[PDB]
Scaffold this motif. Structure first.
Motif, PDB file in Angstrom:
ATOM      1  N   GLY D 239       1.034  -0.986   0.032  1.00  0.00           N
ATOM      2  CA  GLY D 239      -0.244   0.028   0.035  1.00  0.00           C
ATOM      3  C   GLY D 239       0.936   1.253   0.364  1.00  0.00           C
ATOM      4  O   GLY D 239       0.395   1.878   0.483  1.00  0.00           O
ATOM      5  N   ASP D 240       2.087   1.119  -0.526  1.00  0.00           N
ATOM      6  CA  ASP D 240       2.780   2.138  -0.622  1.00  0.00           C
ATOM      7  C   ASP D 240       3.209   2.744  -2.054  1.00  0.00           C
ATOM      8  O   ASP D 240       3.094   2.066  -2.626  1.00  0.00           O
ATOM      9  N   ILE D 241       3.358   4.087  -2.413  1.00  0.00           N
ATOM     10  CA  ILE D 241       3.357   5.074  -3.977  1.00  0.00           C
ATOM     11  C   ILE D 241       4.489   5.184  -4.035  1.00  0.00           C
ATOM     12  O   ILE D 241       4.906   5.905  -3.830  1.00  0.00           O
ATOM     13  N   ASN D 242       5.145   4.158  -4.471  1.00  0.00           N
ATOM     14  CA  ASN D 242       6.826   4.573  -4.874  1.00  0.00           C
ATOM     15  C   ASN D 242       6.726   5.248  -5.879  1.00  0.00           C
ATOM     16  O   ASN D 242       5.594   5.490  -7.222  1.00  0.00           O
ATOM     17  N   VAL D 243       7.788   7.087  -5.578  1.00  0.00           N
ATOM     18  CA  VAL D 243       7.883   7.698  -7.138  1.00  0.00           C
ATOM     19  C   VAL D 243       9.398   7.549  -7.710  1.00  0.00           C
ATOM     20  O   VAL D 243       9.678   7.882  -6.117  1.00  0.00           O
ATOM     21  N   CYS D 244       9.732   8.527  -8.612  1.00  0.00           N
ATOM     22  CA  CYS D 244      10.565   8.839  -8.681  1.00  0.00           C
ATOM     23  C   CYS D 244      11.155   9.588  -9.439  1.00  0.00           C
ATOM     24  O   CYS D 244      10.037  10.558 -10.194  1.00  0.00           O
ATOM     25  N   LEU D 245      12.063  10.998  -9.123  1.00  0.00           N
ATOM     26  CA  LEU D 245      12.017  11.891 -10.037  1.00  0.00           C
ATOM     27  C   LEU D 245      13.372  11.848 -11.013  1.00  0.00           C
ATOM     28  O   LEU D 245      14.508  12.657  -9.778  1.00  0.00           O
ATOM     29  N   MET D 246      14.018  11.583 -11.985  1.00  0.00           N
ATOM     30  CA  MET D 246      14.596  11.852 -12.722  1.00  0.00           C
ATOM     31  C   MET D 246      14.721  13.239 -13.614  1.00  0.00           C
ATOM     32  O   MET D 246      14.072  13.668 -13.500  1.00  0.00           O
ATOM     33  N   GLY D 247      16.577  13.280 -14.142  1.00  0.00           N
ATOM     34  CA  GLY D 247      16.098  14.868 -14.624  1.00  0.00           C
ATOM     35  C   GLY D 247      18.180  15.065 -15.146  1.00  0.00           C
ATOM     36  O   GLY D 247      18.229  14.245 -15.148  1.00  0.00           O
ATOM     37  N   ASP D 248      17.976  16.642 -15.041  1.00  0.00           N
ATOM     38  CA  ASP D 248      19.038  16.908 -15.009  1.00  0.00           C
ATOM     39  C   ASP D 248      19.864  17.823 -13.396  1.00  0.00           C
ATOM     40  O   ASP D 248      18.382  18.724 -13.365  1.00  0.00           O
ATOM     41  N   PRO D 249      20.868  18.407 -13.737  1.00  0.00           N
ATOM     42  CA  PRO D 249      21.001  19.423 -12.005  1.00  0.00           C
ATOM     43  C   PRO D 249      20.623  20.305 -12.375  1.00  0.00           C
ATOM     44  O   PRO D 249      20.806  20.909 -13.688  1.00  0.00           O
ATOM     45  N   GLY D 250      19.757  20.828 -11.338  1.00  0.00           N
ATOM     46  CA  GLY D 250      19.375  22.248 -11.439  1.00  0.00           C
ATOM     47  C   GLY D 250      17.647  22.338 -11.443  1.00  0.00           C
ATOM     48  O   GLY D 250      17.478  23.444 -10.486  1.00  0.00           O
ATOM     49  N   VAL D 251      17.220  21.807 -12.452  1.00  0.00           N
ATOM     50  CA  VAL D 251      15.915  21.384 -11.544  1.00  0.00           C
ATOM     51  C   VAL D 251      15.676  21.207 -10.224  1.00  0.00           C
ATOM     52  O   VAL D 251      16.320  20.560  -9.631  1.00  0.00           O
ATOM     53  N   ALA D 252      14.597  21.501  -9.460  1.00  0.00           N
ATOM     54  CA  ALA D 252      14.212  21.999  -8.251  1.00  0.00           C
ATOM     55  C   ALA D 252      14.238  20.390  -7.481  1.00  0.00           C
ATOM     56  O   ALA D 252      12.948  20.030  -7.517  1.00  0.00           O
ATOM     57  N   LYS D 253      14.945  19.829  -6.998  1.00  0.00           N
ATOM     58  CA  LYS D 253      14.435  17.472  -7.180  1.00  0.00           C
ATOM     59  C   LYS D 253      15.018  17.949  -5.070  1.00  0.00           C
ATOM     60  O   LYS D 253      14.370  17.755  -4.654  1.00  0.00           O
ATOM     61  N   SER D 254      16.187  18.510  -4.997  1.00  0.00           N
ATOM     62  CA  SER D 254      16.798  17.913  -3.481  1.00  0.00           C
ATOM     63  C   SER D 254      16.028  18.943  -2.614  1.00  0.00           C
ATOM     64  O   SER D 254      15.636  18.360  -1.770  1.00  0.00           O
ATOM     65  N   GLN D 255      15.453  20.157  -3.246  1.00  0.00           N
ATOM     66  CA  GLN D 255      14.370  20.746  -2.346  1.00  0.00           C
ATOM     67  C   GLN D 255      13.179  20.534  -2.191  1.00  0.00           C
ATOM     68  O   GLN D 255      12.614  20.336  -0.699  1.00  0.00           O
ATOM     69  N   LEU D 256      12.316  19.703  -3.723  1.00  0.00           N
ATOM     70  CA  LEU D 256      11.390  19.535  -3.513  1.00  0.00           C
ATOM     71  C   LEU D 256      11.155  18.521  -2.571  1.00  0.00           C
ATOM     72  O   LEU D 256      10.780  18.098  -1.123  1.00  0.00           O
ATOM     73  N   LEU D 257      12.370  17.903  -2.752  1.00  0.00           N
ATOM     74  CA  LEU D 257      13.023  16.400  -1.670  1.00  0.00           C
ATOM     75  C   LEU D 257      13.145  16.550   0.169  1.00  0.00           C
ATOM     76  O   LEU D 257      11.756  15.592   0.820  1.00  0.00           O
ATOM     77  N   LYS D 258      13.573  17.761   0.630  1.00  0.00           N
ATOM     78  CA  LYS D 258      13.853  17.594   1.710  1.00  0.00           C
ATOM     79  C   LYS D 258      12.087  18.596   2.341  1.00  0.00           C
ATOM     80  O   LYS D 258      12.048  18.251   3.415  1.00  0.00           O
ATOM     81  N   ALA D 259      11.222  19.235   1.303  1.00  0.00           N
ATOM     82  CA  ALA D 259      10.084  19.726   1.768  1.00  0.00           C
ATOM     83  C   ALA D 259       9.509  18.795   1.988  1.00  0.00           C
ATOM     84  O   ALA D 259       8.459  18.602   3.164  1.00  0.00           O
ATOM     85  N   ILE D 260       8.836  17.540   0.964  1.00  0.00           N
ATOM     86  CA  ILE D 260       8.189  16.969   1.070  1.00  0.00           C
ATOM     87  C   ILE D 260       8.422  16.343   2.075  1.00  0.00           C
ATOM     88  O   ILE D 260       7.606  15.281   2.609  1.00  0.00           O
ATOM     89  N   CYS D 261       9.910  15.717   2.513  1.00  0.00           N
ATOM     90  CA  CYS D 261       9.621  15.022   3.624  1.00  0.00           C
ATOM     91  C   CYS D 261      10.157  15.700   4.824  1.00  0.00           C
ATOM     92  O   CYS D 261      10.060  14.488   6.202  1.00  0.00           O
ATOM     93  N   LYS D 262      10.101  16.964   5.191  1.00  0.00           N
ATOM     94  CA  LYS D 262       9.488  17.707   6.468  1.00  0.00           C
ATOM     95  C   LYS D 262       8.485  17.680   6.521  1.00  0.00           C
ATOM     96  O   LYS D 262       8.080  17.263   7.817  1.00  0.00           O
ATOM     97  N   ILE D 263       7.666  17.341   5.699  1.00  0.00           N
ATOM     98  CA  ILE D 263       6.121  17.463   5.366  1.00  0.00           C
ATOM     99  C   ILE D 263       5.329  16.848   6.767  1.00  0.00           C
ATOM    100  O   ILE D 263       4.506  16.913   7.398  1.00  0.00           O
ATOM    101  N   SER D 264       5.722  14.846   6.090  1.00  0.00           N
ATOM    102  CA  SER D 264       5.709  14.400   7.273  1.00  0.00           C
ATOM    103  C   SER D 264       5.762  14.453   8.533  1.00  0.00           C
ATOM    104  O   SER D 264       6.855  14.628   8.537  1.00  0.00           O
ATOM    105  N   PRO D 265       4.780  13.016   9.016  1.00  0.00           N
ATOM    106  CA  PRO D 265       5.354  13.351  10.211  1.00  0.00           C
ATOM    107  C   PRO D 265       6.123  12.616  11.177  1.00  0.00           C
ATOM    108  O   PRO D 265       7.297  12.867  11.369  1.00  0.00           O
TER     109      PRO D 265
END
Ligand SMILES: Nc1ncnc2c1ncn2[C@@H]1O[C@H](COP(=O)(O)OP(=O)(O)OP(=O)(O)O)[C@@H](O)[C@H]1O
Ligand SMILES: Nc1ncnc2c1ncn2[C@@H]1O[C@H](COP(=O)(O)OP(=O)(O)O)[C@@H](O)[C@H]1O
Ligand SMILES: [Mg+2]
Ligand SMILES: [Mg+2]
Ligand SMILES: [Zn+2]
Ligand SMILES: [Zn+2]
Ligand SMILES: [Zn+2]
Lengths: 409, 611, 308, 294, 101
Positions: D239-265
DNA sequence: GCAGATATCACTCAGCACGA
DNA sequence: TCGTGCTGAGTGATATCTGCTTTGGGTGGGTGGGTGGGTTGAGGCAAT
């Protein structure tokens, strides 16, 4: 094999009785009982088994007490007086085990000697030491008396077992000179307070009484000659000495008390037989007065002290002590003598499941004597309330109330 | 008339004894049903009978000294409502009273019934009661000082148990002078030694000595219980509580088992130093265990024999082993025959022959491979769910180590050894280094593992079945290339496996439709698993097929025909023998018939698939 | 006070050892012949088959010896010595010039062929002092050591001698000087020359692997061999022992000259109360005294002689 | 008759003097003023003070005896002994007037059913990173909890604990050889704890990041963890929705990762290598001290 | 070489080639054995002695054992074309040591 | 200052012989 | 027929005395402290 099976069956019964006192759980399981006495106070007793049975609780409360009253037992070894180990100081039950062949050879040798030359040896020894009574040393006296007693006992047992043998082979036993010698030695020992030779003489006198009774029973017509010998051995002084012997025996070794019991039983049996058969004359001897001389507090104390070691005793000794108890209780009606407390404790200890073996011959006598004593004691206690306190302290000797105290009227 | 009373309370012990005796004498299970508001479930045979009388009679016939008790039964009766509270609050005294009352009840039953049973056996036997189901199960982190010396109920996982410890019960003393022997009891761990010889003639003081080898002894053992992982509040080190078990309960729970234990929560001081009576103020807490519960009838046999008569038994079992998986009947059938296993042969003048079947499930990814692996892992009584790249060569077989407690060289059991008699499960066979795979060469061939290194030279039995799965080198399976290329693995290894299936996820307008309708309903009857396990256990234990002449006559033909069309080696013939024996086991037959071997050969050809 | 049951068991054992015979292909006395064999070949141990014991005397003798072996062992030795004296007197004593070293021979009785065989896990405290047989694998074997059997001390004050002192489990010294005049009570010197010693070897055995439950640590046990049964068990192999299950106390607590006193979290508290243990507690440890051991698993003329 | 403490069934605790009350009535509050393990010196011994720190160790509740009860097997009388130290000596002989007048040598035996016990816990409190001077290491202070306050402290927690700072005098021979140095501890008295929906809740995954609306919707779906996990006769569906974010350096991935990952308890940010030595899944390492594979 | 039980001193513990003195030793999968272990049985095959010079344990033991082994080919099946040495990864010395193939 | 193992001295009790 | 003063004997309580460490090892700790001391080497197994 059969004897081993019987002994194993006895040990199994003892183990079963012991198991009743052990807890199913382990030692550290715990559990405290609080038993309240009628005066609104409760005492704490530990242990799982004490919870269900009150007797076990009281017994454990008793055992927890630490202080013990003194018991002083001054006993002198035979080596101190220069005597060898023998029946005098050995255990009542210590038996030397023999192989079949060795035992058969021993029996054959003893039988041949008794059939051959016991009388001549006894005659020579008794004459020699009658010539030399004064310089006798304790060792020789004890040895001679013990030899006499042992051989007379063995001949009596052989005669009882089988009739093929003869009882005249110990003819010198009834010969007058030996009897006078034995009586003189016993009297001298009593006068000089030499207890070892006294015990030996007691055993010898017991054996002589057994022999005389057996020979009289075998042939009463020829006992007219025997009637001569009995008149000598029941002299007033001798009767007093025999009566006093049990009294002093209380504060002595177990074997001495056993010999006292044996001698008293034999004397009573012979006296009863002779009184019933004909008029006994030494002064006419009536069984009533001699019986009365034997009913005293020290005698009962000695008997109770003897029965305190019933665990190591044999069936015959128990039977004899209880026969004397029955005599005192019924024949003379002196129940006040046996209305003590040590007897009650001893009876309960012997009738207890852990005490005397239930499937045993003596238990019948114990149960009968109990039943009778308990019934009579209940009747007396109902009649006389004051006896509730008399069970503890010894009987009075006051003229004003002594008669009422003893006979109740 | 002194009155016996439990210390610190006002409960009369005689009242407890009489009430318990009455409860045992006259108790019918119908009361228990009435209490639980289950009146309509009362029958007229079992619930109208004296329960504990039958229990005690069975005890006597079987010669046992144990009676398990249920507290809810005490609550059911009328006279023993207060006895429940008394047992809860004062466990030791009530337990002792109950034991003695049980012994008295047995003795009275024997005497009154006028039976010929000898009284000696019962008289010398110690009887003990083991109450359980005494209320809610307290947590290992909720035991306070208030709950000291009270009956509690716990559940946890056994971590370690000490060897048997002899605990003294009755001491034995012998007088050095007169050689007189007496036995004295022990109270609260203290020997009631005598000051002087108990005999009257001999009274020498301080002459008594303890004969160590003639004292009665009991059994003691210490266990460590760790609370269940669920109870852990915030992921810390789980707490542990020590337990003590005596007499029968010794060697009743092994290391690494989930148990429910009822006992007394005791407390005991700790001595500050060995050579003084001084005590620490902090007390050690532990549990005195009185009951432990580790968390075929003729009627069942009559029921089981009814299924075997069913003509479509094969389909029923194949459909019940894995209810959820859809349209994999051949795969299910192959899996089922592994659970039953071949026939065991003891064989001197040679070596033992074992009827264990090995199955390989290699195919396209999305097909239900791991699901079947888990499904079988649940059914089998023993098994380890080892995976690929998560297991090591040593880890599978055995690990050499040392025991700190004993300071001796010992060896642990690996995944394969731990599955002795079960069915091992491997998920990613391809994703496994060939160094570890070489271990499986001996397991599938000799059913044993031999280790010789660092002074340890011994062989551990690994009589287990292997069930492995593999995935294709590419994203899918390509039919064009041969099997040896698509799945990886050495060609010779694929020959060892008894059956090698090939399940592929073809694309169709009807198969996909039906599969989608089947996997979406989650948001043709099948036997309950509880009965199926009993069925397979009974078949595996009792039945033992023996080949017949008709079987051999055509087995030679089948093997020679398999070899003629050409990979096919003697291992295939042995696999046919094992499968024919296993299928006969399913129908509960002691002889393997032509039909069973025909089915075995049918399965083998149609696994690799009949192009 | 003598033990009547012990003496009766002694007599029964003597009779069994004397009159027992088994029908051969002729009838010969097995044990009298065995005693003659020992007399000729100078052997200490006399092997006795348990089935023969059970056959004779309705099995009561067998039950007595098996259920309580530690108790009855001395009486069996007494019976054996009496029989040897009756038939082979010279065997009693130990065997150009005269030799004064003639000590009493310490006979040993070995029982074998027990109807049942146990396992290390089946050992229980209910059967301490019983005759039983076990099987295991030898994991270790300590060296042969001399064990003090019957010491002999000399007073340090009057230079007397006290001999035939029995050592139970620790170094035991006399208490009262036999000399009436001497006042010595605790000062003694061991006469290491006049004492007697026995061969002693400790062997550790662990339960056989197949018998073990799946994934369980093997259980170990200590076995003691004495007399002629030393250096018979060897590491690695599997042997069947027969003997008596004994329990060894913590001798340090009882009081040893020179030595000082002294998993489970304080719950392993022993038993206290003895006068010797003023405030200390005694803990026990199970062991095994084995009397019989069985091993489960040059030129042409030498081999040919062995062949029948 | 019996000691007063035996009958007591309540616990008395002191609440410190709050700063607001002190300032209201023109006084200075010494007890409530938080301190650090560094500032707790010998001058504060025997006072009511407050300590601020992080709990780093807790112990299991154990019963500490306060009043022992004995029973004489002879008198039927109970003897109570007060214990107010780390160690005590048990009584042996009865001291009752019955055992005195009769001079009976009755033996006293301990009975845990009538004694008095108090729950006991031992914990450790350590300084925060904001109180350690440069070049110094954090210190730890032992805390003793008695009565009902037990279980109010758990590992890894920031608390303001008020208690009595007392020493623990040694007993026996240890007192002579120990010296004048005193081992101290804190007796806890009070503890204070430092504590179109779709489009809207999507554009709020990391308001700072600008683009990637659909990606943010997907991360919101991940947060919800949308599933109704189904277990039938054994089958388990993840019951887990795994997701991946590929691309090239510069697009906001790590910032998104830490924000989304702080949001959860609950969340754990780590590199592909893993959490320090142990890599992602798991690993078995030889124990440095016990040499046991853990 | 393993430290003595209840001892600080090292001692020699026997091995497979020592327990099989004057006997036959069996190896099931010779090829799967590592190269490091293969060279271990080089002195015992011909010299019939084992010499170890480890921690303070200088000694020269004797192992007069006959060794019998079973090996698989380099690949999966025996190649007829390739020579014996080609089929087996074993090098010249070990093959020369063996009496028969 | 404290607990444990050890040996010292003083006090009181049951037996004994004589005299009343 | 018997009552009581003298004696040897044996525990009970109390006087001095030694001892108050002890010990190698991490489920004894480091708020018990280094003037109480602890100084390997081979072999097996995971990571790679
Ligand atoms: N749409 C955006 N809105 C705001 N800032 C953005 C946006 N796109 C990129 N950035 C900025 O781009 C910079 C890229 O650095 P960042 O930490 O995101 O590295 P990254 O390339 O995403 O990381 P990695 O490749 O290591 O996973 C950040 O400062 C981020 O603020
Ligand atoms: N025939 C089928 N019956 C039931 N479920 C299926 C079937 N085919 C596919 N599935 C579903 O597809 C998923 C496949 O995952 P999994 O079994 O782990 O594949 P693998 O283990 O081969 O990688 C399962 O979760 C299962 O629910
Ligand atoms: Mg899978
Ligand atoms: Mg990044
Ligand atoms: Zn005695
Ligand atoms: Zn001397
Ligand atoms: Zn008292």
């Amino acid at each position: 094999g059969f004897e081993l099976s019987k002994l194993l069956q006895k040990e199994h019964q003892m183990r079963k009785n012991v198991i009743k006192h052990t807890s199913a759980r382990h030692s550290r399981f715990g559990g405290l009982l609080s038993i309240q006495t009628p005066d609104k106070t409760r005492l704490t007793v530990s242990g799982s088994q004490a919870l269900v049975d009150e007797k076990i609780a009281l017994q454990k409360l008793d055992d927890s007490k630490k202080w013990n009253k003194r018991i002083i037992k001054k006993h002198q070894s035979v080596a101190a007086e220069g005597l060898p180990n023998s029946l005098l100081n050995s255990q009542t039950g210590k038996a030397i085990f023999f192989t079949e062949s060795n035992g058969k050879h021993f029996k054959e040798f003893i039988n041949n000697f008794i059939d051959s030359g016991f009388n001549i040896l006894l005659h020579s020894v008794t004459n020699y030491f009658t010539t030399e009574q004064d310089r006798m040393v304790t060792l020789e006296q004890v040895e001679y008396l013990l030899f006499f007693a042992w051989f007379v006992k063995y001949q009596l047992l052989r005669s009882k077992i089988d009739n093929s043998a003869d009882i005249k082979q110990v003819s010198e036993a009834l010969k007058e000179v030996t009897f006078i010698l034995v009586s003189s030695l016993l009297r001298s020992a009593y006068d000089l307070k030499n207890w070892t030779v006294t015990h030996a003489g007691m055993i010898a006198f017991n054996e002589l009484l057994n022999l005389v009774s057996r020979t009289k029973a075998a042939q009463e017509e020829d006992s007219t000659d025997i009637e001569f010998i009995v008149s000598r051995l029941f002299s007033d002084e001798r009767i007093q000495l025999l009566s006093n012997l049990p009294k002093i025996g209380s504060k002595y070794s177990l074997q001495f008390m056993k010999s006292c019991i044996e001698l008293t039983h034999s004397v009573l049996k012979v006296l009863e037989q002779y009184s019933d058969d004909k008029t006994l004359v030494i002064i006419e001897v009536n069984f009533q007065k001699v019986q009365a001389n034997y009913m005293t507090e020290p005698v009962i104390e000695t008997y109770i002290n003897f029965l305190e070691r019933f665990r190591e005793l044999e069936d015959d000794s128990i039977k004899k002590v209880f026969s004397f108890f029955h005599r005192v209780f019924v024949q003379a009606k002196e129940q006040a003598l046996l209305f003590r407390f040590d007897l009650i404790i001893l009876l309960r200890e012997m009738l207890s499941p852990d005490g005397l073996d239930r499937m045993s011959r003596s238990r019948k006598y114990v149960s009968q004597f109990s039943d009778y004593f308990l019934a009579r004691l209940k009747k007396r206690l109902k009649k006389s309330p004051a006896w509730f306190v008399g069970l503890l302290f010894p009987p009075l000797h006051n003229s004003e109330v002594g008669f009422y105290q003893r006979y109740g009227e | 008339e002194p009155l016996r009373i439990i210390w610190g309370t006002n409960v009369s012990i005689q009242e407890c004894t009489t009430n318990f005796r009455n409860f045992l004498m006259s108790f019918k299970y119908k009361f228990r049903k009435i209490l639980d508001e289950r009146e309509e479930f009362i029958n007229n045979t079992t619930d109208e009978e004296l329960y504990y009388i039958k229990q005690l009679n069975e005890m006597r016939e079987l010669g046992t000294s144990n009676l398990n008790l249920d507290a809810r039964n005490l609550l059911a009766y009328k006279q023993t409502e207060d006895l429940y509270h008394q047992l809860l609050n004062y466990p030791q005294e009530v337990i002792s009273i109950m034991d003695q009352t049980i012994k008295d009840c047995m003795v009275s039953l024997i005497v009154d019934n006028n039976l010929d049973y000898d009284l000696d056996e019962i008289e010398t036997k110690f009887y003990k009661v083991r109450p359980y189901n005494v209320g809610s199960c307290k947590g290992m982190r909720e035991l306070n000082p208030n709950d000291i010396d009270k009956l509690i109920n716990l559940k946890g996982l056994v971590l370690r148990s000490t060897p048997v410890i002899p605990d003294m019960k009755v001491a034995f003393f012998k007088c050095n002078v007169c050689d007189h022997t007496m036995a004295v009891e022990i109270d609260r761990g203290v020997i009631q030694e005598p000051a002087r010889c108990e005999r009257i003639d001999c009274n020498e003081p301080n002459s008594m000595s303890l004969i160590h080898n003639r004292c009665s002894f009991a059994d003691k053992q210490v266990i460590k219980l760790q609370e269940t992982p669920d109870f852990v509040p915030d992921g810390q080190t789980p707490h542990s509580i020590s337990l003590c078990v005596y007499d029968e309960l010794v060697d009743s729970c092994r290391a690494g088992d989930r148990i429910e234990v009822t006992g007394t929560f005791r407390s005991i001081p700790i001595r500050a130093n060995s050579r003084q009576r001084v005590l620490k103020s902090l007390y050690k807490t532990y549990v005195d265990v009185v009951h432990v519960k580790k968390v075929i009838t003729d009627q069942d046999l009559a029921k089981i024999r009814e299924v075997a008569a069913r003509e479509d038994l094969y389909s029923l079992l194949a459909r019940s082993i894995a209810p959820s998986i859809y349209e994999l009947e051949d795969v299910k059938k192959g899996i089922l025959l592994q659970l039953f296993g071949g026939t065991n042969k003891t064989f001197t003048k040679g070596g033992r022959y074992r009827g264990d079947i090995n199955i390989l499930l290699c195919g396209d990814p999305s097909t239900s491979k791991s699901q079947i692996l888990q499904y079988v892992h649940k059914i089998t009584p023993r098994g380890v769910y080892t995976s690929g790249k998560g297991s090591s060569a040593v880890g599978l077989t055995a690990y050499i180590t040392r025991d700190v407690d004993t300071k001796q060289l010992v060896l642990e059991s690996g995944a394969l050894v731990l599955s002795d008699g079960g069915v091992c499960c491997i998920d990613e066979f391809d994703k496994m280094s060939d160094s570890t795979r070489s271990v499986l060469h001996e397991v599938m061939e000799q059913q044993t593992i031999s280790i010789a290194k660092a002074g340890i030279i011994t062989t551990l039995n690994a009589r287990s079945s292997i069930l492995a799965s593999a995935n294709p080198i590419g994203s899918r399976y390509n039919p064009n290339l041969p099997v040896t290329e698509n799945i990886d693995l050495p060609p010779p290894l694929l020959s060892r496996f008894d059956l090698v299936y090939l399940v592929l996820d073809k694309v169709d307008e009807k198969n996909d439709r039906e599969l989608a309708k089947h996997l979406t309903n989650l948001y043709d009857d099948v036997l309950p698993v509880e009965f199926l396990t009993m069925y397979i256990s009974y078949a595996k234990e009792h039945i033992h097929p023996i080949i017949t002449e008709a079987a051999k006559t055509e087995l030679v033909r089948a093997y020679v025909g398999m070899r003629k069309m050409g990979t096919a080696t003697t291992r295939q013939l042995e696999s046919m023998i094992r499968l024919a024996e296993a299928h006969a086991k399913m129908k509960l037959k002691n002889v393997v018939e032509l039909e069973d071997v025909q089915e075995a050969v049918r399965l083998i050809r149609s696994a690799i698939k009949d192009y | 006070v003598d033990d009547v049951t012990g003496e009766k068991v002694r007599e029964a054992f003597e009779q069994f050892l004397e009159d027992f015979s088994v029908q051969s292909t002729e009838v010969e006395k097995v044990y009298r012949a065995q005693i003659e064999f020992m007399k000729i070949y100078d052997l200490n141990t006399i092997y006795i088959d348990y089935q023969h014991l059970s056959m004779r005397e309705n099995g009561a003798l067998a039950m007595a010896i098996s259920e309580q072996y530690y108790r009855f062992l001395p009486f069996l030795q007494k019976g054996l010595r009496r029989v040897v004296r009756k038939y082979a007197p010279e065997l009693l004593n130990t065997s150009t010039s005269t030799s004064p070293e003639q000590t009493e021979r310490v006979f040993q009785i070995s029982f074998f062929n027990l109807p049942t065989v146990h396992r290390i896990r089946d050992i229980r405290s209910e059967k301490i002092g019983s005759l039983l047989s076990i099987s295991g694998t030898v994991t270790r074997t300590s060296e042969v050591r001399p064990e003090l059997y019957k010491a002999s001390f000399t007073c340090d004050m009057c230079r007397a001698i006290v001999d035939n002192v029995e050592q139970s489990f620790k170094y035991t010294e006399p208490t009262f000087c036999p000399n009436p005049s001497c006042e010595n009570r605790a000062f003694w010197t061991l006469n290491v020359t006049r004492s007697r010693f026995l061969d002693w070897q400790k062997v550790r055995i662990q339960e056989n692997a197949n018998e073990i439950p799946t994934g369980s640590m093997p259980r170990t046990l200590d076995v003691i061999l004495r007399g002629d049964s030393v250096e018979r068990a060897k590491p690695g192999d599997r042997c069947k022992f027969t003997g008596v299950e004994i329990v060894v106390p913590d001798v340090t607590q009882l009081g040893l000259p020179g030595v000082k006193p002294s998993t489970t979290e304080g719950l392993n508290s022993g038993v206290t109360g003895l006068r010797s243990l003023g405030v200390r507690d005694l803990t026990y440890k199970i062991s095994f005294l084995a009397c019989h051991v069985i091993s489960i698993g040059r030129d042409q003329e030498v081999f040919l002689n062995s062949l029948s | 008759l019996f000691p007063p403490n035996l009958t007591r069934r309540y616990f008395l605790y002191f609440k410190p003097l709050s700063q607001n009350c002190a300032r209201r009535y023109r006084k200075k509050a010494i007890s409530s003023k938080p301190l650090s393990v560094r500032q707790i010196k010998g001058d504060f011994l025997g006072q009511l003070i407050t300590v601020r720190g992080i709990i780093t160790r807790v112990s299991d509740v154990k019963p500490a005896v306060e009043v022992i009860a004995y029973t004489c097997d002879q008198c039927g009388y109970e003897v109570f002994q007060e214990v107010n130290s780390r160690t005590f000596t048990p009584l042996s002989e009865c001291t009752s007037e019955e055992c005195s007048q009769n001079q009976t040598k009755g033996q006293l035996f301990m009975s845990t059913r009538a004694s008095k016990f108090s729950a006991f816990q031992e914990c450790k409190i350590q300084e925060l990173s904001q109180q350690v001077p440069v070049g110094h290491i954090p210190r730890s202070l032992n805390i003793h909890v008695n009565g009902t306050l037990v279980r109010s402290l758990s590992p890894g927690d920031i608390v303001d604990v008020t208690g009595i700072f007392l020493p623990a005098p040694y007993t026996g021979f240890k007192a002579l050889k120990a010296g004048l140095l005193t081992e101290t501890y804190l007796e806890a008295q009070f503890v204070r704890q430092h504590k179109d929906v779709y489009n809207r809740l999507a554009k709020s995954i990391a308001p700072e990041i600008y683009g990637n609306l659909d990606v943010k919707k997907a991360l919101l779906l991940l947060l919800v963890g949308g599933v109704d996990k189904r277990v039938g006769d054994g089958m388990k569906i993840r019951g887990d929705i795994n997701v991946c974010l590929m691309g090239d350096p510069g697009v906001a991935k790590s910032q998104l990762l830490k924000a989304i990952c702080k949001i959860s308890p609950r969340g754990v940010y780590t590199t592909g290598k893993g959490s320090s030595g142990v890599g992602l899944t798991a690993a078995v390492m030889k124990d440095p001290v016990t040499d046991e594979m853990i | 070489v393993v430290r003595d039980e209840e001892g600080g001193d090292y001692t020699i513990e026997a091995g497979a080639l020592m327990l099989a003195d004057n006997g036959i030793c069996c190896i099931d999968e010779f090829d799967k054995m590592d190269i490091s272990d293969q060279v271990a049985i080089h002195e015992a095959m011909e010299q019939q002695t084992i010499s170890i010079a480890k921690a303070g344990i200088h000694a020269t033991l004797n192992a007069r054992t006959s060794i019998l082994a079973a090996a698989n080919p380099v690949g999966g099946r025996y190649n007829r074309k390739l020579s014996l040495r080609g089929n087996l990864n074993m090098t010249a010395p070990i093959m020369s040591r063996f009496d028969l193939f």
